[PDB]
Amino acid sequence: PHPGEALYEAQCASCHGKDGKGGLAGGELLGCDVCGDFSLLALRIEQTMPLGNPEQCDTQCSSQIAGYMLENFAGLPPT
Ligand code: HEC
Ligand SMILES: [Cl-]
Ligand SMILES: [Cl-]
Ligand SMILES: [Cl-]
Protein backbone atom coordinates (compact mmCIF):
# COMPACT_ATOMS: atom_id res chain seq x y z
CA PRO A 1 0.00 0.00 0.00
CA HIS A 2 1.44 3.31 -1.20
CA PRO A 3 -1.26 5.97 -0.66
CA GLY A 4 1.03 8.87 -1.66
CA GLU A 5 1.83 7.18 -4.98
CA ALA A 6 -1.85 6.42 -5.58
CA LEU A 7 -2.89 9.99 -4.73
CA TYR A 8 -0.16 11.48 -6.90
CA GLU A 9 -1.28 9.31 -9.82
CA ALA A 10 -4.96 10.22 -9.28
CA GLN A 11 -4.54 13.97 -8.71
CA CYS A 12 -1.15 15.17 -10.03
CA ALA A 13 0.37 12.95 -12.72
CA SER A 14 -2.08 14.25 -15.36
CA CYS A 15 0.03 17.45 -15.36
CA HIS A 16 3.27 16.59 -13.62
CA GLY A 17 3.87 13.15 -15.17
CA LYS A 18 4.67 9.71 -13.76
CA ASP A 19 8.24 10.83 -12.97
CA GLY A 20 7.54 14.45 -12.04
CA LYS A 21 8.89 15.90 -15.33
CA GLY A 22 5.47 16.49 -16.94
CA GLY A 23 4.90 19.94 -18.46
CA LEU A 24 7.11 22.35 -20.40
CA ALA A 25 10.86 22.41 -20.00
CA GLY A 26 11.19 19.49 -17.56
CA GLY A 27 8.27 20.42 -15.27
CA GLU A 28 7.82 22.46 -12.11
CA LEU A 29 8.83 19.86 -9.56
CA LEU A 30 12.53 19.04 -9.85
CA GLY A 31 14.54 21.65 -7.95
CA CYS A 32 11.50 23.67 -6.83
CA ASP A 33 11.90 26.41 -4.22
CA VAL A 34 10.31 24.46 -1.34
CA CYS A 35 11.28 21.01 -2.61
CA GLY A 36 14.11 20.61 -0.09
CA ASP A 37 11.83 20.96 2.96
CA PHE A 38 9.16 18.29 3.46
CA SER A 39 6.82 20.54 5.43
CA LEU A 40 7.06 23.47 3.00
CA LEU A 41 6.54 21.20 -0.03
CA ALA A 42 3.48 19.68 1.67
CA LEU A 43 2.25 23.18 2.62
CA ARG A 44 2.57 24.46 -0.94
CA ILE A 45 0.69 21.42 -2.23
CA GLU A 46 -2.04 21.92 0.37
CA GLN A 47 -2.38 25.62 -0.51
CA THR A 48 -2.18 25.52 -4.29
CA MET A 49 -2.46 22.04 -5.83
CA PRO A 50 -4.07 20.51 -7.75
CA LEU A 51 -4.11 23.72 -9.77
CA GLY A 52 -7.25 25.75 -9.13
CA ASN A 53 -8.79 23.13 -6.78
CA PRO A 54 -6.51 22.44 -3.77
CA GLU A 55 -9.42 21.12 -1.64
CA GLN A 56 -9.39 17.92 -3.79
CA CYS A 57 -6.37 16.81 -1.73
CA ASP A 58 -6.78 16.99 2.09
CA THR A 59 -3.89 17.82 4.50
CA GLN A 60 -3.06 14.14 4.87
CA CYS A 61 -3.15 13.80 1.07
CA SER A 62 -0.68 16.67 0.67
CA SER A 63 1.70 15.14 3.26
CA GLN A 64 1.52 11.69 1.69
CA ILE A 65 2.16 13.05 -1.80
CA ALA A 66 5.07 15.22 -0.61
CA GLY A 67 6.61 12.10 0.99
CA TYR A 68 6.05 10.05 -2.14
CA MET A 69 7.69 12.64 -4.37
CA LEU A 70 10.70 13.21 -2.06
CA GLU A 71 11.17 9.43 -1.75
CA ASN A 72 10.80 8.58 -5.44
CA PHE A 73 11.74 11.55 -7.68
CA ALA A 74 15.53 11.85 -7.99
CA GLY A 75 16.72 15.46 -8.03
CA LEU A 76 13.55 16.90 -6.48
CA PRO A 77 15.49 19.02 -3.91
CA PRO A 78 17.12 22.25 -5.13
CA THR A 79 20.91 22.02 -5.55
C1 HEC B 1 -1.38 17.07 -7.20
C2 HEC B 1 -1.75 16.78 -5.93
C3 HEC B 1 -0.32 18.01 -7.44
C4 HEC B 1 0.88 18.24 -6.75
C5 HEC B 1 1.46 17.49 -5.63
C6 HEC B 1 1.47 19.33 -7.48
N1 HEC B 1 0.71 19.79 -8.46
FE1 HEC B 1 1.10 21.34 -9.69
N2 HEC B 1 1.52 22.86 -10.88
C7 HEC B 1 0.94 23.13 -12.06
C8 HEC B 1 1.41 24.36 -12.67
C9 HEC B 1 0.99 24.94 -13.97
C10 HEC B 1 2.43 24.83 -11.80
C11 HEC B 1 3.20 26.10 -11.95
C12 HEC B 1 2.52 27.19 -11.07
C13 HEC B 1 1.69 28.29 -11.69
O1 HEC B 1 2.22 29.07 -12.48
O2 HEC B 1 0.51 28.46 -11.35
C14 HEC B 1 2.40 23.84 -10.73
C15 HEC B 1 3.31 23.94 -9.65
C16 HEC B 1 3.47 22.90 -8.69
C17 HEC B 1 4.55 22.96 -7.70
C18 HEC B 1 5.64 23.97 -7.54
C19 HEC B 1 5.20 25.11 -6.67
C20 HEC B 1 6.41 25.91 -6.22
O3 HEC B 1 6.66 25.92 -5.01
O4 HEC B 1 7.07 26.56 -7.06
C21 HEC B 1 4.37 21.78 -6.95
C22 HEC B 1 5.17 21.31 -5.80
C23 HEC B 1 3.20 21.14 -7.53
N3 HEC B 1 2.69 21.84 -8.57
C24 HEC B 1 2.69 19.92 -7.06
C25 HEC B 1 -0.09 22.37 -12.65
C26 HEC B 1 -0.77 21.29 -12.04
C27 HEC B 1 -1.87 20.62 -12.64
C28 HEC B 1 -2.35 20.95 -13.98
C29 HEC B 1 -3.69 20.82 -14.38
C30 HEC B 1 -2.28 19.64 -11.70
C31 HEC B 1 -3.36 18.65 -11.77
C32 HEC B 1 -1.38 19.83 -10.60
N4 HEC B 1 -0.47 20.77 -10.85
C33 HEC B 1 -1.39 19.03 -9.44
C34 HEC B 1 -0.36 19.00 -8.49
CL1 LIG C 1 3.64 6.44 -1.07
CL1 LIG D 1 7.51 12.44 -16.08
CL1 LIG E 1 3.02 22.88 -19.28
Residue numbers in the entry: 7 to 85
Paper passage:
We therefore set out to characterize two previously unstudied proteins from the shipworm symbiont Teredinibacter turnerae that were initially identified by the presence of carbohydrate binding domains appended to uncharacterized domains with probable redox functions. One of these was TERTU_3803, which contained both a CBM10 and a CBM2 domain attached to a range of distinct modules (via flexible linkers) that did not bare any sequence similarity with catalytic domains typically found within carbohydrate-active enzymes. Using a ‘module walking’ approach, we searched for other genes coding for these X-domains. This led to the identification of TERTU_2913, which lacks CBMs but contains predicted X122, X183 and X132 domains. Taken together, these sequence analyses suggested that TERTU_3803 and TERTU_2913 could have a role to play in cellulose metabolism, and furthermore that role is likely to be a redox one given the presence of cytochrome domains within their linear amino acid sequences.
TtX183A, TtX183B and TtX183C, which all derive from TERTU_2913, were expressed and purified from the E. coli periplasm following co-expression with the cytochrome maturation machinery encoded on the pEC86 plasmid. All three proteins underwent crystal trials but only TtX183A and TtX183B formed diffracting crystals. The structure for TtX183A was determined via single-wavelength anomalous dispersion from the anomalous signal generated by the haem iron to a resolution of 1.4 Å. The resulting model was subsequently used to determine the structure of TtX183B via molecular replacement to 1.8 Å resolution. The polypeptide chain in each of TtX183A and TtX183B fold around the haem to produce a tertiary structure dominated by α-helices, as expected for small c-type cytochromes [Fig. 2(a)]. To examine the structural similarities within our TtX183 domain structures, we compared TtX183A with TtX183B and found that the structures superposed with one another with an r.m.s.d. of 1.12 Å over 59 Cα positions. In the structures of TtX183A and TtX183B, the haem propionate groups are highly solvent exposed where in CjX183 a loop was found to interact with these groups. This is likely to provide an easier exit route for electrons when O2 is present, explaining the apparent lack of stability of the reduced state for the TtX183s compared with CjX183.
